[PDB]
Amino acid sequence: RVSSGRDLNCVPEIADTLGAVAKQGFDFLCMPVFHPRFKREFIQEPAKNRPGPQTRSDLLLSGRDWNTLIVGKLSPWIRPDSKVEKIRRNSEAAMLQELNFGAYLGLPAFLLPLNQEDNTNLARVLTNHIHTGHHSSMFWMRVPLVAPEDLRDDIIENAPTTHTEEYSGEEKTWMWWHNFRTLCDYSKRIAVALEIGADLPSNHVIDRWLGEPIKAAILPTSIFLTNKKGFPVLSKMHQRLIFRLLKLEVQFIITGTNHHSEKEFCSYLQYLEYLSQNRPPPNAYELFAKGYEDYLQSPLQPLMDNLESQTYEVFEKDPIKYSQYQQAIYKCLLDRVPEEEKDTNVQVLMVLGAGRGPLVNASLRAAKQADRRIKLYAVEKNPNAVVTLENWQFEEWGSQVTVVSSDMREWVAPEKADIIVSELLGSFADNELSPECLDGAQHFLKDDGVSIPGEYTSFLAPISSSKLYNEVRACREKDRDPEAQFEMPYVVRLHNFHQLSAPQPCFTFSHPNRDPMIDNNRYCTLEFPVEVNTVLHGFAGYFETVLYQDITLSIRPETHSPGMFSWFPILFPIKQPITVREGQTICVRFWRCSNSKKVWYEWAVTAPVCSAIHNPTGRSYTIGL
Amino acid sequence: LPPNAPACMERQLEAARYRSDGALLLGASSLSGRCWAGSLWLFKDPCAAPNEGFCSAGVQTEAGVADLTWVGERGILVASDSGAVELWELDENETLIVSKFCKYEHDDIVSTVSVLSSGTQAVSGSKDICIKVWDLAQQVVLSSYRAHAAQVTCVAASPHKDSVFLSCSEDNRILLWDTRCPKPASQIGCSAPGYLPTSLAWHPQQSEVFVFGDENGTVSLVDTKSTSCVLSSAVHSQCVTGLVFSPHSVPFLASLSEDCSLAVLDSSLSELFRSQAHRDFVRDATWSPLNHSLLTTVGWDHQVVHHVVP
Ligand SMILES: CSC[C@H]1O[C@@H](n2cnc3c(N)ncnc32)[C@H](O)[C@@H]1O
Numbered sequence: 001r002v003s004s005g006r007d008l009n010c011v012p013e014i015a016d017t018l019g020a021v022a023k024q025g026f027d028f029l030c031m032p033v034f035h036p037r038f039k040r041e042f043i044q045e046p047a048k049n050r051p052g053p054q055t056r057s058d059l060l061l062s063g064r065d066w067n068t069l070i071v072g073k074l075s076p077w078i079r080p081d082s083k084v085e086k087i088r089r090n091s092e093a094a095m096l097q098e099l100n101f102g103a104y105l106g107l108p109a110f111l112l113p114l115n116q117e118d119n120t121n122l123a124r125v126l127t128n129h130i131h132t133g134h135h136s137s138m139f140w141m142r143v144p145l146v147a148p149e150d151l152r153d154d155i156i157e158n159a160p161t162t163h164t165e166e167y168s169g170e171e172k173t174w175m176w177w178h179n180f181r182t183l184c185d186y187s188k189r190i191a192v193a194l195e196i197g198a199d200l201p202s203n204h205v206i207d208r209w210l211g212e213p214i215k216a217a218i219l220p221t222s223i224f225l226t227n228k229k230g231f232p233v234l235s236k237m238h239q240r241l242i243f244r245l246l247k248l249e250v251q252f253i254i255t256g257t258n259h260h261s262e263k264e265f266c267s268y269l270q271y272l273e274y275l276s277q278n279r280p281p282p283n284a285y286e287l288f289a290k291g292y293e294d295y296l297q298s299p300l301q302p303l304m305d306n307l308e309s310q311t312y313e314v315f316e317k318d319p320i321k322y323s324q325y326q327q328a329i330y331k332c333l334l335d336r337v338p339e340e341e342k343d344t345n346v347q348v349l350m351v352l353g354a355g356r357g358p359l360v361n362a363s364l365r366a367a368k369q370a371d372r373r374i375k376l377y378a379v380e381k382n383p384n385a386v387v388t389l390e391n392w393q394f395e396e397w398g399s400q401v402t403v404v405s406s407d408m409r410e411w412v413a414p415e416k417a418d419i420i421v422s423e424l425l426g427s428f429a430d431n432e433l434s435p436e437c438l439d440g441a442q443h444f445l446k447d448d449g450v451s452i453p454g455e456y457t458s459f460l461a462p463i464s465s466s467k468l469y470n471e472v473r474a475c476r477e478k479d480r481d482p483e484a485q486f487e488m489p490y491v492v493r494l495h496n497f498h499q500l501s502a503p504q505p506c507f508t509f510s511h512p513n514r515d516p517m518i519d520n521n522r523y524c525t526l527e528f529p530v531e532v533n534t535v536l537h538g539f540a541g542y543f544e545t546v547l548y549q550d551i552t553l554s555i556r557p558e559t560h561s562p563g564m565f566s567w568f569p570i571l572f573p574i575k576q577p578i579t580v581r582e583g584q585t586i587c588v589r590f591w592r593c594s595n596s597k598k599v600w601y602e603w604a605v606t607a608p609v610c611s612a613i614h615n616p617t618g619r620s621y622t623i624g625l
Numbered sequence: 626l627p628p629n630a631p632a633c634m635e636r637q638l639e640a641a642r643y644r645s646d647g648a649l650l651l652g653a654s655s656l657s658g659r660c661w662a663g664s665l666w667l668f669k670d671p672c673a674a675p676n677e678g679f680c681s682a683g684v685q686t687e688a689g690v691a692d693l694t695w696v697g698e699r700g701i702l703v704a705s706d707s708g709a710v711e712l713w714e715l716d717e718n719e720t721l722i723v724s725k726f727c728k729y730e731h732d733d734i735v736s737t738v739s740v741l742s743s744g745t746q747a748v749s750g751s752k753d754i755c756i757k758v759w760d761l762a763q764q765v766v767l768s769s770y771r772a773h774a775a776q777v778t779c780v781a782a783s784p785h786k787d788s789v790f791l792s793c794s795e796d797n798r799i800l801l802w803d804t805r806c807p808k809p810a811s812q813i814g815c816s817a818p819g820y821l822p823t824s825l826a827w828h829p830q831q832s833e834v835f836v837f838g839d840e841n842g843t844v845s846l847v848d849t850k851s852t853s854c855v856l857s858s859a860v861h862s863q864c865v866t867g868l869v870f871s872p873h874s875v876p877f878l879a880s881l882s883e884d885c886s887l888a889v890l891d892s893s894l895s896e897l898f899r900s901q902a903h904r905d906f907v908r909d910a911t912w913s914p915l916n917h918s919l920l921t922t923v924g925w926d927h928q929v930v931h932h933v934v935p
Pocket residue numbers: 302303306307315352353354355356379380381382385406407408409423424437
């Protein structure tokens with residue numbers, strides 16, 4: 001199903017008009033709150049004293065209908081940024097008036113136009129309306145993909161259309177929006193209703209709108225081609241956009257007179273629902289992360305915190321991860337136990353942070369798979385989970401498994417270990433402090449001992465999403481730094497966003513760590529070639545680990561382990577968004593810092609411009625030891 | 626109430642046109658209240674306007690009427706909010722008005738209409754930013770033009786050439802058109818860019834001169850040849866909505882503005898007459914064919930005012 005609406009600048013009888021669009025199958029109506037041609041005077045007599053009513057009564061519809069079925073429209077005559085004083089003054093009062101009426105009616109959204117570069121006074125007037133009471137009603141800015149001046153036919157002799165190359169010029173429509181939105185201090189209520197024309201721009205220009213808050217897409221009747229059978233259809237490339245737009249889950253709005261007069265306006269809408277259902281279906285991942293898109297969560301800390309039962313439940317809900325683990329251990333055993341030594345030699349396998357023992361069962365299956373003999377210690381500091389292990393051990397595992405209720409850093413092991421197995425990784429790999437935990441337990445691994453996982457590596461990529469930037473901004477909480485939100489990472493299924501460059505590795509860690517002096521503190525400098533004009537809003541985090549040899553796990557999209565939903569990506573926000581221009585390199589600096597007590601990340605952008613160093617001294621965010 | 630004739634007239638009188646014979650054609654819309662629509666009315670007695678009862682003929686239109694024009698003596702061409710251009714043909718007894726055709730070609734409100742010299746062709750201007758040329762005979766659009774980058778305010782046909790007309794838009798562009806040329810439009814204007822073009826009026830006799838009004842109440846007299854603005858006076862305290870030349874040998878210019886005021890001016894654009902009669906927006910002005918000293922105005926005050934001009 002597609003949420004779809006009808007835009008009209010002509011409504012004679014609101015009752016009949018709304019009826020029609022319902023029968024035609026439209027979920028909502030975009031229509032004028034005052035007659036589009038009904039200009040109003042506020043300052044100069046006598047026309048200021050024009051007898052009312054000034055527009056049609058709220059009584060003509062149910063409040064419910066006003067709240068759900070109607071999207072308001074600013075009158076086209078209202079031009080707040082006019083060079084003529086008297087027009088700006090009347091346009092100011094008219095905009096307020098019309099905007100206040102939408103509020104009075106409880107309209108769910110109100111359409112405003114960005115058809116020129118200077119909508120400064122328009123931004124200023126709306127801003128006031130927004131700061132006049134606190135309401136949720138959305139404002140859709142009608143901004144065309146392609147400016148109307150760059151769409152005009154080359155039919156003026158003396159004023160010919162410029163066909164010269166215009167990279168930045170062909171993106172002038174986004175800067176219109178960017179500036180308006182910026183003046184209005186990135187208010188959650190101001191979103192984009194993107195208008196599409198017959199001539200699409202370059203993927204380039206379409207690429208500008210990736211992270212932008214697009215609540216609606218407006219499709220004129222004009223852009224629709226005619227199928228053999230006279231049916232409204234669309235270009236393949238027009239269609240690529242619609243599929244793109246469907247992933248962003250925008251509402252669709254049909255504007256203009258029905259040029260396919262044979263068939264009803266359900267003809268146009270039929271096409272969209274046709275394309276909607278004809279989209280390729282959602283993979284497990286797409287299905288798994290169905291509610292979680294651009295939904296910010298704090299990263300888990302299973303060291304300083306004791307995880308809840310249902311937390312482990314969803315850890316365990318990913319079979320691919322444990323199949324990978326079984327395989328790594330399967331392979332490792334065969335590499336350490338020759339078939340001559342199978343029955344004479346039994347390996348000492350220690351699961352460190354066993355939770356409810358999914359890695360214990362994997363270790364067991366791996367041994368029955370490798371027909372080799374294994375001894376198991378399940379070491380777990382969470383005593384709530386230690387309960388689950390002991391019930392498993394008693395009822396099932398038997399004396400083959402020795403449950404150890406201890407921190408791996410403290411535990412004095414009876415005997416040293418052939419292999420150590422661990423799940424101590426987060427969306428940025430080292431963020432749960434696997435390095436420190438495994439470094440502490442390292443001493444009770446044999447000199448020839450193996451660590452599964454052997455190695456892990458964080459990756460970072462710059463991103464643009466004004467959506468998520470504002471989500472972080474809104475995470476401000478009383479009785480803390482007002483900007484603490486910006487100085488902390490968030491695990492999130494990034495969705496409405498743009499990767500500005502290729503992921504590069506950040507921090508790498510190897511277990512065991514042979515270094516004479518072991519330091520898990522890291523300073524990394526990274527340089528991101530950017531080939532588009534954009535605005536940096538933060539850095540997306542991913543990781544890869546090597547369980548054993550070729551067996552690996554990745555949330556890095558390029559190498560992403562397929563069907564594995566065990567980790568969403570991490571996000572490092574920045575306080576102030578940074579404009580980046582095509583060709584420019586983004587230089588970021590990441591530090592992993594440590595106490596006796598705590599570990600944290602500090603980050604800075606040095607190019608194209610310097611940022612503040614974020615999370616200095618872990619003031620805003622730290623990870624417990 | 627003639628047969629089909631509505632009982633009451635919409636308050637907002639947008640168009641006032643005098644036939645050759647001296648009849649009065651009125652177009653009115655409903656810009657407020659439950660019903661947003663428009664009607665067409667004929668007053669064979671001009672002085673009985675706007676009384677719906679004492680009207681020759683009357684009809685109701687699906688939607689509002691943004692602009693209107695006479696076609697010969699029996700046809701009315703209608704610019705609708707529907708984005709449709711409609712032709713309404715008069716009764717033989719001229720007692721009723723019937724829709725010859727209603728075509729939804731414009732994607733937004735149809736803001737302006739003019740009739741070409743032939744009367745077999747017409748030009749439409751819309752907030753869709755498009756200008757279309759029509760065959761009134763074939764009831765189809767010959768050519769559609771997307772010259773402008775803003776909604777088209779006014780379109781006005783050359784008096785004596787079927788291929789030439791003016792167009793003005795909020796893109797600060799006045800376009801001279803010749804369908805004959807492969808690039809039919811030519812951007813024409815005063816020395817410096819200025820306030821948006823609002824109103825266009827060709828000279829009766831001097832086919833190479835016209836006047837445009839701006840949203841700053843300044844009327845400017847333009848000669849195509851010289852491509853430079855000959856004369857400009859600030860007639861109105863508001864936007865200049867309409868400009869209408871007298872039937873006189875040396876014509877007079879009627880100036881209507883949102884200042885709710887009318888001015889009448891000589892050749893040199895100097896101001897002979899001014900009328901504060903209207904208490905709302907002055908929408909149209911027609912000179913009586915019968916008495917050339919009589920000029921009739923309509924307002925959104927539903928006032929039909931007959932002026933005697935010195
Ligand atoms: C299964 S997710 C990781 C598991 O490791 C456990 N864990 C984390 N750090 C340590 C540690 N230092 N010693 C023992 N168990 C740990 C956590 O309680 C969690 O159940």
